Short mmCIF file of C-alpha atoms and ligand atoms in Angstrom, two decimals:
data_model
loop_
_atom_site.label_atom_id
_atom_site.label_comp_id
_atom_site.label_asym_id
_atom_site.label_seq_id
_atom_site.Cartn_x
_atom_site.Cartn_y
_atom_site.Cartn_z
CA UNK A 1 -16.57 -23.78 2.16
CA UNK A 2 -13.74 -22.24 4.22
CA UNK A 3 -10.64 -22.70 6.39
CA UNK A 4 -10.58 -21.32 9.93
CA UNK A 5 -7.69 -20.49 12.24
CA UNK A 6 -8.36 -19.99 15.93
CA UNK A 7 -6.78 -17.10 17.81
CA UNK A 8 -4.17 -18.08 20.42
CA UNK A 9 -5.90 -15.58 22.71
CA UNK A 10 -9.58 -16.17 22.03
CA UNK A 11 -10.36 -13.50 19.43
CA UNK A 12 -12.75 -14.38 16.59
CA UNK A 13 -11.19 -17.01 14.31
CA UNK A 14 -9.61 -16.07 10.98
CA UNK A 15 -11.70 -17.27 8.03
CA UNK A 16 -10.39 -17.96 4.54
CA UNK A 17 -12.65 -18.81 1.57
CA UNK A 18 -11.77 -21.64 -0.80
CA UNK A 19 -10.17 -21.65 -3.34
CA UNK A 20 -7.55 -19.66 -1.45
CA UNK A 21 -6.85 -16.26 -3.05
CA UNK A 22 -3.57 -14.99 -4.48
CA UNK A 23 -2.24 -11.59 -3.38
CA UNK A 24 0.53 -11.17 -5.94
CA UNK A 25 3.15 -13.30 -7.66
CA UNK A 26 4.84 -13.81 -4.30
CA UNK A 27 2.00 -14.05 -1.76
CA UNK A 28 -1.09 -16.22 -1.48
CA UNK A 29 -3.55 -16.96 1.34
CA UNK A 30 -2.34 -20.57 1.55
CA UNK A 31 1.19 -19.60 2.59
CA UNK A 32 -0.09 -16.85 4.88
CA UNK A 33 -1.98 -19.60 6.71
CA UNK A 34 1.06 -21.83 6.97
CA UNK A 35 3.13 -18.85 8.11
CA UNK A 36 0.59 -17.74 10.70
CA UNK A 37 0.61 -21.21 12.28
CA UNK A 38 4.41 -21.12 12.18
CA UNK A 39 4.48 -17.79 14.02
CA UNK A 40 1.88 -18.59 16.64
CA UNK A 41 4.02 -21.67 17.37
CA UNK A 42 6.90 -19.25 17.98
CA UNK A 43 4.82 -17.28 20.50
CA UNK A 44 3.72 -20.45 22.30
CA UNK A 45 6.38 -23.18 22.80
CA UNK A 46 3.83 -25.75 24.04
CA UNK A 47 1.88 -25.26 20.82
CA UNK A 48 5.08 -25.92 18.89
CA UNK A 49 5.48 -29.21 20.80
CA UNK A 50 1.99 -30.34 19.82
CA UNK A 51 2.45 -29.27 16.20
CA UNK A 52 5.64 -31.27 15.55
CA UNK A 53 3.82 -34.56 16.15
CA UNK A 54 2.68 -35.86 12.80
CA UNK A 55 2.88 -32.93 10.47
CA UNK A 56 5.41 -34.42 8.10
CA UNK A 57 5.01 -31.99 5.16
CA UNK A 58 1.96 -34.02 4.12
CA UNK A 59 0.20 -30.88 2.88
CA UNK A 60 -0.58 -29.59 -0.60
CA UNK A 61 -1.48 -25.91 -0.77
CA UNK A 62 -3.66 -26.93 -3.72
CA UNK A 63 -5.74 -29.52 -1.85
CA UNK A 64 -8.69 -28.34 0.23
CA UNK A 65 -8.77 -31.47 2.39
CA UNK A 66 -5.01 -31.24 2.94
CA UNK A 67 -5.14 -27.58 4.03
CA UNK A 68 -8.16 -28.40 6.21
CA UNK A 69 -6.13 -31.11 7.95
CA UNK A 70 -3.46 -28.50 8.71
CA UNK A 71 -5.89 -25.95 10.13
CA UNK A 72 -7.77 -28.53 12.19
CA UNK A 73 -4.52 -29.91 13.58
CA UNK A 74 -3.48 -26.39 14.57
CA UNK A 75 -6.94 -25.63 15.96
CA UNK A 76 -6.96 -28.77 18.12
CA UNK A 77 -3.51 -27.82 19.44
CA UNK A 78 -4.92 -24.38 20.32
CA UNK A 79 -7.76 -26.02 22.28
CA UNK A 80 -5.34 -28.18 24.31
CA UNK A 81 -3.10 -25.20 25.10
CA UNK A 82 -6.22 -23.31 26.22
CA UNK A 83 -7.08 -26.20 28.53
CA UNK A 84 -3.49 -26.23 29.75
CA UNK A 85 -3.87 -22.55 30.68
CA UNK A 86 -6.93 -23.52 32.75
CA UNK A 87 -4.79 -25.77 34.92
CA UNK A 88 -1.65 -24.48 36.61
CA UNK A 89 0.41 -23.57 33.51
CA UNK A 90 0.73 -19.80 32.98
CA UNK A 91 -1.03 -18.27 29.94
CA UNK A 92 0.93 -16.60 27.16
CA UNK A 93 1.90 -13.20 28.56
CA UNK A 94 -0.52 -10.66 27.08
CA UNK A 95 -0.15 -7.04 26.00
CA UNK A 96 3.50 -7.37 24.93
CA UNK A 97 5.07 -6.05 21.72
CA UNK A 98 5.59 -8.44 18.82
CA UNK A 99 9.04 -9.73 17.97
CA UNK A 100 10.61 -8.30 14.81
CA UNK A 101 9.96 -11.51 12.88
CA UNK A 102 6.32 -11.69 13.93
CA UNK A 103 5.87 -8.01 13.07
CA UNK A 104 7.20 -8.52 9.56
CA UNK A 105 4.61 -11.27 9.15
CA UNK A 106 1.75 -9.26 10.67
CA UNK A 107 2.37 -6.25 8.40
CA UNK A 108 2.63 -8.46 5.32
CA UNK A 109 -0.65 -10.07 6.42
CA UNK A 110 -2.36 -6.69 6.93
CA UNK A 111 -1.04 -5.47 3.59
CA UNK A 112 -2.28 -8.67 1.84
CA UNK A 113 -5.82 -8.12 3.16
CA UNK A 114 -5.84 -4.33 2.67
CA UNK A 115 -4.12 -3.47 -0.60
CA UNK A 116 -6.46 -5.57 -2.71
CA UNK A 117 -5.19 -3.96 -5.92
CA UNK A 118 -1.46 -3.07 -5.53
CA UNK A 119 -1.47 -1.76 -9.11
CA UNK A 120 -3.67 1.21 -8.22
CA UNK A 121 -0.85 2.60 -6.06
CA UNK A 122 0.99 3.26 -9.32
CA UNK A 123 -1.81 5.44 -10.73
CA UNK A 124 0.05 8.57 -9.66
CA UNK A 125 1.25 11.43 -11.82
CA UNK A 126 4.86 10.61 -12.79
CA UNK A 127 7.57 13.18 -12.09
CA UNK A 128 5.49 14.78 -9.33
CA UNK A 129 5.74 14.78 -5.49
CA UNK A 130 2.87 12.31 -5.71
CA UNK A 131 5.30 9.57 -6.80
CA UNK A 132 4.66 6.46 -4.70
CA UNK A 133 7.35 4.19 -3.29
CA UNK A 134 7.48 1.93 -0.24
CA UNK A 135 10.29 2.02 2.37
CA UNK A 136 11.49 -1.52 3.15
CA UNK A 137 10.53 -3.14 6.54
CA UNK A 138 14.21 -3.54 7.29
CA UNK A 139 15.07 0.12 6.86
CA UNK A 140 12.30 1.06 9.27
CA UNK A 141 13.60 -1.64 11.62
CA UNK A 142 17.07 -0.08 11.41
CA UNK A 143 15.67 3.40 11.99
CA UNK A 144 13.83 2.13 15.05
CA UNK A 145 17.01 0.51 16.40
CA UNK A 146 19.27 3.51 15.87
CA UNK A 147 16.77 6.23 16.87
CA UNK A 148 16.02 5.25 20.47
CA UNK A 149 12.55 6.63 21.19
CA UNK A 150 10.65 7.07 24.44
CA UNK A 151 7.14 7.82 25.66
CA UNK A 152 8.15 11.48 25.48
CA UNK A 153 8.48 11.32 21.69
CA UNK A 154 5.93 12.06 18.97
CA UNK A 155 6.39 10.32 15.61
CA UNK A 156 5.17 11.56 12.25
CA UNK A 157 5.50 10.02 8.79
CA UNK A 158 4.94 12.88 6.30
CA UNK A 159 3.49 11.36 3.15
CA UNK A 160 2.64 8.05 4.80
CA UNK A 161 1.11 6.23 1.81
CA UNK A 162 -0.87 3.19 2.95
CA UNK A 163 0.65 3.77 6.39
CA UNK A 164 2.92 0.74 6.95
CA UNK A 165 5.80 2.81 8.39
CA UNK A 166 3.54 4.21 11.12
CA UNK A 167 2.20 0.73 11.99
CA UNK A 168 5.63 -0.85 12.32
CA UNK A 169 6.90 2.00 14.50
CA UNK A 170 3.75 2.02 16.63
CA UNK A 171 4.08 -1.71 17.24
CA UNK A 172 7.77 -1.42 18.15
CA UNK A 173 8.08 1.74 20.27
CA UNK A 174 6.33 3.45 23.15
CA UNK A 175 5.86 6.93 21.68
CA UNK A 176 2.95 8.85 23.18
CA UNK A 177 1.36 8.92 19.74
CA UNK A 178 2.30 8.09 16.16
CA UNK A 179 0.93 9.91 13.13
CA UNK A 180 0.82 9.35 9.40
CA UNK A 181 -0.48 11.97 6.95
CA UNK A 182 -1.05 11.20 3.25
CA UNK A 183 -2.47 13.49 0.54
CA UNK A 184 -3.45 11.20 -2.35
CA UNK A 185 -6.87 9.54 -2.19
CA UNK A 186 -5.81 6.05 -3.28
CA UNK A 187 -3.10 5.39 -0.65
CA UNK A 188 -5.24 7.22 1.91
CA UNK A 189 -8.17 4.91 1.15
CA UNK A 190 -6.08 1.78 1.62
CA UNK A 191 -4.68 3.26 4.84
CA UNK A 192 -8.20 3.08 6.29
CA UNK A 193 -8.35 -0.67 5.75
CA UNK A 194 -4.69 -1.03 6.75
CA UNK A 195 -5.68 0.56 10.05
CA UNK A 196 -8.66 -1.73 10.62
CA UNK A 197 -6.77 -4.90 9.67
CA UNK A 198 -3.79 -3.98 11.84
CA UNK A 199 -5.91 -3.49 14.97
CA UNK A 200 -7.81 -6.68 14.18
CA UNK A 201 -4.72 -8.82 13.62
CA UNK A 202 -2.77 -7.42 16.57
CA UNK A 203 -5.73 -8.38 18.79
CA UNK A 204 -5.83 -11.76 17.06
CA UNK A 205 -2.20 -12.48 18.04
CA UNK A 206 -2.60 -10.78 21.40
CA UNK A 207 0.09 -8.16 20.80
CA UNK A 208 0.20 -4.56 21.96
CA UNK A 209 0.91 -1.39 19.98
CA UNK A 210 1.30 2.27 20.91
CA UNK A 211 -1.31 4.86 19.91
CA UNK A 212 -1.37 5.90 16.25
CA UNK A 213 -3.58 7.80 13.80
CA UNK A 214 -3.58 7.57 10.02
CA UNK A 215 -5.00 10.74 8.47
CA UNK A 216 -5.68 12.22 5.02
CA UNK A 217 -4.15 15.64 4.45
CA UNK A 218 -1.50 17.95 3.04
CA UNK A 219 1.53 18.23 5.31
CA UNK A 220 2.31 21.68 3.86
CA UNK A 221 -1.01 23.14 5.06
CA UNK A 222 -1.41 25.70 7.84
CA UNK A 223 -2.63 23.13 10.36
CA UNK A 224 0.57 21.16 9.81
CA UNK A 225 3.07 24.01 10.32
CA UNK A 226 2.67 23.88 14.09
CA UNK A 227 2.05 20.12 14.16
CA UNK A 228 5.47 19.60 12.59
CA UNK A 229 7.04 22.07 15.02
CA UNK A 230 5.92 19.83 17.91
CA UNK A 231 7.08 16.51 16.45
CA UNK A 232 10.26 15.08 17.97
CA UNK A 233 10.81 12.40 15.31
CA UNK A 234 9.83 12.86 11.68
CA UNK A 235 10.15 10.25 8.96
CA UNK A 236 9.87 11.47 5.37
CA UNK A 237 10.59 9.63 2.12
CA UNK A 238 11.31 12.78 0.08
CA UNK A 239 13.39 11.12 -2.63
CA UNK A 240 10.86 12.18 -5.29
CA UNK A 241 9.45 15.28 -3.60
CA UNK A 242 11.44 17.87 -5.55
CA UNK A 243 13.34 21.11 -4.63
CA UNK A 244 10.11 23.09 -4.17
CA UNK A 245 8.48 20.74 -1.65
CA UNK A 246 11.81 20.13 0.13
CA UNK A 247 12.25 23.90 0.41
CA UNK A 248 8.85 24.31 2.08
CA UNK A 249 9.62 21.44 4.47
CA UNK A 250 12.86 23.13 5.52
CA UNK A 251 10.89 26.24 6.50
CA UNK A 252 8.79 24.04 8.72
CA UNK A 253 11.63 22.01 10.25
CA UNK A 254 13.24 25.33 11.18
CA UNK A 255 10.68 25.61 13.98
CA UNK A 256 11.34 22.21 15.56
CA UNK A 257 12.62 21.87 19.13
CA UNK A 258 16.20 21.15 20.18
CA UNK A 259 17.13 17.51 19.68
CA UNK A 260 14.28 16.98 17.23
CA UNK A 261 15.14 14.43 14.54
CA UNK A 262 14.34 13.85 10.87
CA UNK A 263 15.04 10.71 8.82
CA UNK A 264 14.76 10.95 5.02
CA UNK A 265 15.76 9.50 1.61
CA UNK A 266 17.29 12.79 0.49
CA UNK A 267 19.22 15.03 2.89
CA UNK A 268 17.76 18.45 3.68
CA UNK A 269 21.23 19.93 4.26
CA UNK A 270 24.66 18.98 2.88
CA UNK A 271 26.79 16.56 4.90
CA UNK A 272 29.80 18.84 4.37
CA UNK A 273 28.04 21.97 5.65
CA UNK A 274 30.24 24.72 7.10
CA UNK A 275 28.57 27.93 8.32
CA UNK A 276 29.79 31.23 6.89
CA UNK A 277 28.57 34.74 6.00
CA UNK A 278 26.56 33.52 3.00
CA UNK A 279 24.52 30.65 4.45
CA UNK A 280 23.45 32.03 7.84
CA UNK A 281 19.82 31.38 6.89
CA UNK A 282 20.54 27.89 5.49
CA UNK A 283 18.89 24.96 7.31
CA UNK A 284 22.30 23.35 7.82
CA UNK A 285 23.09 25.97 10.49
CA UNK A 286 20.75 24.35 12.99
CA UNK A 287 21.14 20.63 12.35
CA UNK A 288 23.62 17.78 12.35
CA UNK A 289 23.21 15.47 9.38
CA UNK A 290 24.57 11.95 9.31
CA UNK A 291 24.14 9.17 6.80
CA UNK A 292 22.69 6.00 8.31
CA UNK A 293 24.64 2.80 7.69
CA UNK A 294 23.60 0.97 4.53
CA UNK A 295 21.88 -2.34 5.27
CA UNK A 296 24.05 -5.17 3.93
CA UNK A 297 22.72 -6.46 0.64
CA UNK A 298 20.27 -3.69 -0.20
CA UNK A 299 20.61 -1.86 -3.51
CA UNK A 300 18.34 0.56 -5.39
CA UNK A 301 17.90 1.40 -9.07
CA UNK A 302 20.92 3.70 -8.77
CA UNK A 303 22.98 0.53 -8.38
CA UNK A 304 24.25 1.89 -5.07
CA UNK A 305 23.10 0.88 -1.53
CA UNK A 306 19.81 2.52 -0.43
CA UNK A 307 20.58 5.70 1.50
CA UNK A 308 18.77 7.36 4.40
CA UNK A 309 19.80 10.35 6.49
CA UNK A 310 19.35 11.43 10.09
CA UNK A 311 19.04 15.12 10.92
CA UNK A 312 19.20 16.36 14.50
CA UNK A 313 18.10 19.89 15.39
CA UNK A 314 21.24 21.33 16.94
CA UNK A 315 21.26 25.11 17.27
CA UNK A 316 24.54 24.86 19.17
CA UNK A 317 26.08 24.91 15.69
CA UNK A 318 24.90 28.44 14.97
CA UNK A 319 25.62 29.64 18.51
CA UNK A 320 29.21 28.47 18.18
CA UNK A 321 29.55 30.30 14.88
CA UNK A 322 28.52 33.60 16.41
CA UNK A 323 30.85 33.07 19.35
CA UNK A 324 33.65 32.44 16.89
CA UNK A 325 32.80 35.82 15.37
CA UNK A 326 33.36 37.41 18.78
CA UNK A 327 36.62 35.51 19.40
CA UNK A 328 38.77 36.75 17.91
C1 LIG B 401 2.92 18.19 -0.52
N1 LIG B 401 2.06 17.59 0.55
C2 LIG B 401 1.85 16.29 0.83
N2 LIG B 401 1.00 15.97 1.90
C3 LIG B 401 0.73 14.64 2.27
N3 LIG B 401 1.33 13.63 1.52
C4 LIG B 401 2.17 13.90 0.46
C5 LIG B 401 2.44 15.24 0.10
N4 LIG B 401 3.29 15.20 -0.96
C6 LIG B 401 3.55 13.92 -1.27
N5 LIG B 401 2.86 13.10 -0.39
C7 LIG B 401 2.86 11.62 -0.35
O1 LIG B 401 4.11 11.12 0.10
C8 LIG B 401 4.18 9.75 -0.30
C9 LIG B 401 5.63 9.44 -0.65
S1 LIG B 401 5.91 7.66 -0.85
C10 LIG B 401 6.33 7.11 0.82
C11 LIG B 401 5.26 6.23 1.50
C12 LIG B 401 5.62 5.75 2.93
N6 LIG B 401 5.86 6.92 3.84
C13 LIG B 401 6.87 4.86 2.97
O2 LIG B 401 7.93 5.32 3.45
O3 LIG B 401 6.86 3.70 2.53
C14 LIG B 401 3.25 9.59 -1.50
O4 LIG B 401 2.29 8.56 -1.30
C15 LIG B 401 2.65 10.98 -1.70
O5 LIG B 401 1.29 10.94 -2.05
#
C-alpha cells in the first residue's frame, strides 16, 4: 500500500508508504506531497492548467483513497504533459537552477527524509563549541543575494552540521566547488543522507546545482589551515564557538587572499576598529567588517533581530596606517 508521484522529468517516481509518516509537529508526508504537486505545477504552467480542473479541495490528508485520487490526478496530468512534449510543444527547460521558493521546499523535503530523529541533533555537550543550531533558509538566501559569487569563488561552511547551508548555496550559485566540514558524528552522519537525498530530489525535479562536498573533519586541523587560506567565501556560525576557537580561526583567516570574505554570527573583529600602536597584530587591521541588514521580522532569544556579519580581507587598511606613519 503506497502513494506514488511521477517525476516531471522522468526520474523514478517518489513512493510514500501508508499511513503517511509525520516528520515533526509541523511537517508530515501528506503535506509534503500536496506541496510537491503545488511546486511542480509552478515549474510547468501546462500542468497547472490540467490540475485546476476538478480539484476542489475534495481531499482529506487522513483518507488513503482521497490522497490516492490526488496523486493519480497529478500523475495523469504528468503523462499528458509528457505527450505534449512529444508533439511540437517545448519541454520544460532542463539543467536550470531552482527558484527560491522551490529550493525552500526541496531542502525541507530533503531534511524531512534525512533527519529521521531531529532530537539527536541536541545530544551535544552544552556550553561547548559543539553546540548545534541551524541558520535559517532566509538568512542564507540574504547572504547569497548580498555576496555576489562567481565561478571563480570557493565556498566553505566551517562547522556545517547536517549540511543544509552548503546545499542551498550550491543550488543557487555557480561557485567552482562548495564545501562543508563538520566534526561531530551525529550531524556528520545525517549529512551523508542529506547529500544523497538532495542529489536524488534535484534530479527528480530536473534542477541543476553546482559541485559540492560534505565532509567529516576538524576545521582547526593542519589539513584545513591551507584549505581555509584558499577559500574566497567562508560561512561560519560561530555564535557558540567561544574565544578559544574564534582565536584559532583568526590565525587561519589571516592567511586568506585579498577580497576574501567571511560571514558569521559573531564578528571576528570590532566594528569600531581603529589601528594604532597596540593592535598592529589584531585581525581588524586586515579586514572590513560590516553588519548585514536584519531580515524584517526575525528575532532570536536575545529579543533582538538575528545578527550576521560580513568580513572582507582588506590589507589596504594596514598599508594606509603605515603610510600615515610616514606622513607626517
Ligand atoms: C573546532 N573544530 C570544528 N570542526 C568542524 N566542525 C565544528 C568544529 N567546532 C564546532 N563544529 C560544528 O559547528 C557546528 C555549529 S552549528 C551550525 C550548523 C550549520 N553550519 C548552520 O549554519 O546551520 C556544530 O554542528 C559543531 O559540531
